[PDB]
Subunit: 334 residues, 4 copies
C-alpha cells in the first residue's frame, strides 16, 4: 500500500492533516509540503494554534524543510502544481488543501508532476466524493482523483443516510450554524464577488452557501435533488451544528428517530451520538465527522404532514480532518 | 387625551430602551416612575452609556430618588415586590412590566393592587391577550387591563407567518432563530438556574435554547395553533437575530411568488420591513421594525408534489422588538 | 478672492476612505468628493458604503452605475487604476487626493497623484519625514507651499495631544506608551500567513496580539521637542473599533493626579480635537467619537518614591471614526492654504 | 493533612479539582460546598468551554459528585460557619467564593471545624504567597493564608527577578486581562462598580487589579513602590502583564532578558519565551507567569531609563497551578 503523502497547501486543513496523522500513529508519512510561505512561518503556525493549542510534537525548520517529531518534511514553493517536485521524496498521494484545484482537470496537474493519486479536501464537481462510513465502499483501486466533500457534507451525510435507510427522506432542507472561516473577512471590505463574504465575520451572523448542497447528492445518490440548504456563519472560531428539516417516508416519533440514529452510531468511528446538553465548544477537537444530538430532535405533526428536525454537531476543522484521514488511509491501500 | 402616564418596572435592557424609544418618537406618553433594585446613580450611568446603541440622545442626571432626563424628573423606587410600588405617588397608570418576574395575569395583578390601571408585559405571559403589533393588535379593546407583547422572536415570526398563511396557507412549519445572546445567559461557565445550556459562556459558544415564539405564536395567529414548533441557537453577537421558518404551504409556489406576497404585506407597514439587499446581522441593529423579511434567503425545495418553503426574517431582538412594544403601548393607552 | 480648494479625490475606498466621505457629508463640508479610485466594482463599493458593521446604515442615499456612485443624489466617478500616476483626476477636477490605500506612504510615492493632475495629497498614515499633522497640536506648521502632507496614524492622533499637554505643563523627560487597540484589517481572521510578521498571522478576534505602532517613535514629527524621548507598542485585542492609549512618563516636575488632570482639562477646553472625561466609560462609548483623543481623568495614576516619580495618563480614541474626524479637520485647513 | 474541602465550585474550584487529579496529588478532596445542585455541578465539571472535556469520569447523586470513581460530598450552606467540614474530615479549605477574603471572614471555616484555609484571592493583611517567590514564609502555625491573585502570580516573579538583579525603584503595571465572572454579560447592574456593569465581551474595560494591594505582601521591599491596574478585554482566558520600571542600574535589553532567563531556570512556576506568542498560546499553561523576551523595551534619554517587561499568564489554569503548589506545601507543614 502507498505510504508517502504530499500536502499542497499548509493552511488550516493542511496543518491539521499532519497533526491527525501523528496522533493516530499512521503508517502514512508526510514527505513534503508545497506552500509559498517560508518554512520559518509555517513552523510558527504549526507550533502555535489558536484553536487546538501547542502542537504535541517537536517542530523546527531549515531553509527548505520542516522537522517534525525529528522527521524531515520538504517544503517546496511552487505557484503551479504542475511544477511541484513530488517525485523527489516519492510523494504518492497528494492531499490537495489549497482550494485552487477543485476539479479533476485542475488536480491532474499533481499526477503530471509525478504523484499517483490526489485526495481533494473540498467538493470538486463530478467525481467520486466520499464521506467515510457513508459511501467509502464506492472507492476501488483504479481511482486516482477523489474528493472528501466538505465539513458540512461530512456532518449531514451520516444523519441523512440513517434517516433515509430507516424511514426514507422524501425531501429536506438544512441550515448549518457554522463557525467563521478564512474565506470570510476580518473587517468589512471586498472579498471577491460575494457581498456577504465582505462583512466582518466575528461581528455578524452572515448567510452563506454550504458545499453540502452540491456535494450531498454525490454521496447518497438516492437523495440527489431532494435536499437543499445553506449556512449562517457566526462568531465562533470552530465548531458548528447542522439542522436538517425533512419530510420522511413514514410517520415517526422523536424516540423512534433517536433510536434509529443511536443504532447508526453504534461502533461507528465516524458518527457519534450524544444526549448530553452540549454546546459548540464541546465539539472542538472531536474525532467524529458528525455527532447526532438527540436532545434537539423535534417532530411537528399535523395529520398526514410531519416535519422532522434532526441536528448534528461537527468540528468543521478537526472533525472533518479525522474523516479526511480515514478516507486517505483507505485510499492509500487500494 | 389618552392614559398617558407610565411606570417602568425593571430598568434593564428592555426598560431602558422603552424610555429611549418614547423620547425618540416624541411620544405623548410620559414616563413618571421606574422601579428597579439599583441606585439612581447606576441607572443613570447605564442609561447614558449603552454598549449596543451608544450615547443616550438626551441629557441624563440623577438624585437620590430620581432620574432627570432631558430636564424631566422620573421617580426611582427600589421595591422587590410589585405590590409595594407606590405607583399612585406620581400617578403611573400603565405599567410596562420588563423584569421577567411577573409573566402572568396573576403575578402582574400586583401592579393593579398597587394602584395602576393597566399592565403591558414585555414577554410571553401565558393565556392572556398577546399582541404582535400589525398582526393582531385589533384584538385589543377598552376592557383589557393586562396584556402581553409576546417575545422578540414572536414579533419576528408572526408577520412572516401571517403573510404566508393569508396568501398560501401554512399546513405545518418549524422555525429556528439564530439569536443574539441575552442577559438570561452566562458570561463564564457557571450555574444559571436549572437550564444546563444556559450555564455556558455565551460569547464563546453556539448554545441551543428554547424560544418564546414556540408557545406564543397560536395566541397571536389562532388559525396556526398547534401547527408550528421551533427553537433557538444563541450565538456570539450582542444584538441582532434572524428567524428561519421551514413550512409546508397549502399551495405550490415559486420563490418569486413568495417574495411578492411578503413584499405586499410589508407595504405601508411600519412594523414589518422588506429587504432584497444582502444584509448581515449588524445591519439590523437599531431597526425600527419588529421583523424584516429577507427575499435573498427564500428557498423552495421540491420533489414531486412535495414542497418545503424556507423563509427568513431579521430582527433587532432589542430595539426592534421595543418599537413593537411601544406601538402596542401607544394603542393600549388610547383604549 | 482666491477660493479654497473644494474638490477631492479618494484613493482607496476601504474603511478610512468610506468614513472620509461619511464625515464630510455629516459636517456639510464645502469640500465635495468628485472621484474615487479603487479596483473593486461600484456595486460592491455601494454595498459597503450603505452597510457598515461598525457605524450602521449610511445616513444618505446610495446607488451606483457601472462607473460611479450616486451618494445623496450626487455622482462620484469611480476609476479602477492600479497605478496612481494613471488616475484620471483631471476629468472631474479633483484637487486634493486623500490617499488611503497604504501603498503610497512617502513623498516619492504619493507625488504620483500630482503627476496624475491633482494639486495636493493628504496621506491617511505615517509617511516618513514629510510634514505630519495632528490637528490642534501642530497644524499651525502647515503653510501654502505644503503639497504632500501626512496626518500620521490614529494612535499618533491619540498620543500627541496628551503628550503635548504634559510637555507644555510639566515637561516629558522620557516615556513609553501602550495602546490596547481594536483589531484592524492588517491582521488575520484565521491563523495563516500574513506577510512576514509572525503575530499578524494569528486570529485577531480570538487573541491578545502584541503589535508595533511607530506613534511614539516618530512623535518628533509632531512634537519636535519629544523626538527620541518616547517609545511604545500595541496590544491588539478583540473589539471592532475603539482603543485606549496609556502613556507612562517621567515628568519634569513632581505632580499630583489632580494637578495632572487639571492641566489636561485646560488643554481640552475649546478644543474640538481633544476631549475630556471623568466618567467611567469603556471602549464602546468612544465608538463614533468626534475627537481624535479623549483624556480620561479616572485612569490617572502617580507612583512616587522620593524624587522618583512615574505618571500614567490614559486617553481613549476611536481608531476609525475619531482619527477620521482629525483627517477631515486637517483636510479642511489644507484646502484653504 | 491530606483531606481538603472546596468552598465554591466555580471556575477556580473546578479547576483546583482538575489540577489535583492531573498531578496525581495525594491530597484528597472530600467535600465541596456550593448552593447549586450536584446535577449542575457535574455538568459544569464535565464540559468546560476553556479547557475541554474533563479527563476523568463524572457522575452525581442528590448530595454528592462521583469523580474518577471517588465520592465527594456536596453541601449547600450559604454561610461558611455552618459547613459541616468535620463530617468527612476536611482539614484544609480552598476558599474560592470571593465572599471570605479576610482573616476575620475565613475564620468561619475554622469555627466550622477545618484546620486551615487557603484563600484563592488577596485577603488583606495575612501571609500572601506566590509560589517560587515567597513560599518559604509559610510555617506550621499558619492557619489562614492567601495565594494572592492571578495577576500577582504573573507580576511577582518578574518583579523579584528585576529587583534582585537591578533594583526596582518605582514601577507601574497594566495587565491586558481576559474577562471574568465578576463582570457582566450584558450592560446591567453589577454591584457598585460602574465599569463592571458593562458587557465584557464587547468592550475594553478598565478595572482594578489584586496585584496592586498584594504585591507589597509578596515582596516586602517593593511595598509602596508599585501600582497598577487592568484593562479587561474580550478573550475568554489568557492575559498579559506589562511592567514599566525605573531600575537601580543602567541596563540593556539583552541584560534584562538574560537575568530573567536565569530566574526561570529550574523554576516550575515561572516560564520563559522568546517566541512570538499570543494569548491563546498561554491557555492551559502550567506556569504562574511566562516572561516574554520579545516584548522587552528600554527607553533611554541621557541618564534616564524606563524599562518595560512583559509576562503572559493563564489567569485561570496557570494561577490554579500556583494555588495547587502552595496547597501541597501548606498541607505538609
Ligand atoms: N433580547 C432581549 O433582551 C429581549 C427581547 C424581548 C423581550 N425581552 C424580555 O423582556 C424582559 C426583560 O429582558 P431584558 O433583556 O431587559 O433583561 P435585563 O436583565 O437586561 O433587565 C432586567 C432588569 O429588571 C431588573 N429587575 C429584576 N428583578 C426585578 C424586580 N423584582 N423588581 C424591579 N426590577 C427588577 C434588573 O435589575 C434589570 O435591570 C424579559 O421578560 C425578557 O424576556 C428581552
Ligand atoms: C468545512 O469544510 C468548511 O468550513 C466549508 O463549510 P461548508 O458548509 O461545508 O461549505
Ligand atoms: C426577545 O424577547 C428575547 O431575546 C427572548 O428571545 P425569544 O427567542 O423570543 O424567547
Ligand atoms: C489607526 O491609524 C490604525 O488602527 C493604526 O494603528 P497604529 O497604532 O496607529 O499604528
Ligand atoms: C485572577 O486572580 C482574577 O482574574 C483576578 O485578576 P487580578 O488582576 O489578579 O485581580
Amino acid at each position: 500500500s502507498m505510504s508517502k503523502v504530499g500536502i499542497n497547501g499548509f493552511g488550516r486543513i493542511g496543518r491539521l492533516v499532519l497533526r491527525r496523522l501523528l496522533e493516530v500513529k499512521s503508517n502514512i508519512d508526510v514527505v513534503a509540503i508545497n506552500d509559498l510561505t517560508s518554512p520559518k512561518i509555517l513552523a510558527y503556525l504549526l507550533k502555535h494554534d489558536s484553536n487546538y493549542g501547542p502542537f504535541p510534537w517537536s517542530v523546527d525548520f531549515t531553509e527548505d524543510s520542516l522537522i517534525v517529531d525529528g522527521k524531515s518534511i520538504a517544503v517546496y514553493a511552487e505557484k503551479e502544481a504542475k511544477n511541484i517536485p513530488w517525485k523527489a521524496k516519492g510523494a504518492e498521494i497528494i492531499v490537495e488543501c489549497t482550494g485552487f484545484y477543485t476539479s479533476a482537470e485542475k488536480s491532474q496537474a499533481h499526477l503530471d508532476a509525478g504523484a499517483k493519486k490526489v485526495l481533494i479536501s473540498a467538493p470538486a464537481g463530478e467525481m467520486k466524493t466520499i464521506v467515510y462510513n457513508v459511501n467509502d465502499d464506492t472507492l476501488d483501486g483504479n481511482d486516482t482523483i477523489v474528493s472528501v466533500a466538505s465539513c458540512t457534507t461530512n456532518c449531514l451525510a451520516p444523519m441523512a443516510k440513517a434517516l433515509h435507510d430507516s424511514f426514507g427522506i422524501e425531501v429536506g432542507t438544512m441550515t448549518t450554524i457554522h463557525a467563521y472561516t478564512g474565506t470570510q473577512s476580518l473587517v468589512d471590505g471586498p472579498r471577491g464577488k460575494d457581498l456577504r463574504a465582505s462583512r466582518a465575520a466575528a461581528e455578524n451572523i452572515i448567510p452563506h452557501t454550504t458545499g453540502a448542497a452540491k456535494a450531498i447528492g454525490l454521496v447518497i445518490p438516492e437523495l440527489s435533488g431532494k435536499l437543499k440548504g445553506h449556512a449562517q456563519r457566526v462568531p465562533v472560531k470552530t465548531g458548528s451544528v447542522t439542522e436538517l428539516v425533512s419530510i420522511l417516508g413514514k410517520k415517526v416519533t422523536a424516540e423512534e428517530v433517536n433510536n434509529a440514529l443511536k443504532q447508526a452510531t453504534t461502533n461507528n468511528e465516524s458518527f457519534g451520538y450524544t444526549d448530553e446538553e452540549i454546546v459548540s465548544s464541546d465539539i472542538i477537537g472531536s474525532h467524529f465527522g458528525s455527532v447526532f444530538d438527540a436532545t434537539q430532535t423535534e417532530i411537528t405533526a399535523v395529520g398526514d404532514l410531519q416535519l422532522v428536525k434532526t441536528v448534528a454537531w461537527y468540528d468543521n476543522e478537526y472533525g472533518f480532518v479525522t474523516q479526511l484521514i480515514r478516507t486517505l488511509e483507505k485510499f492509500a491501500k487500494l
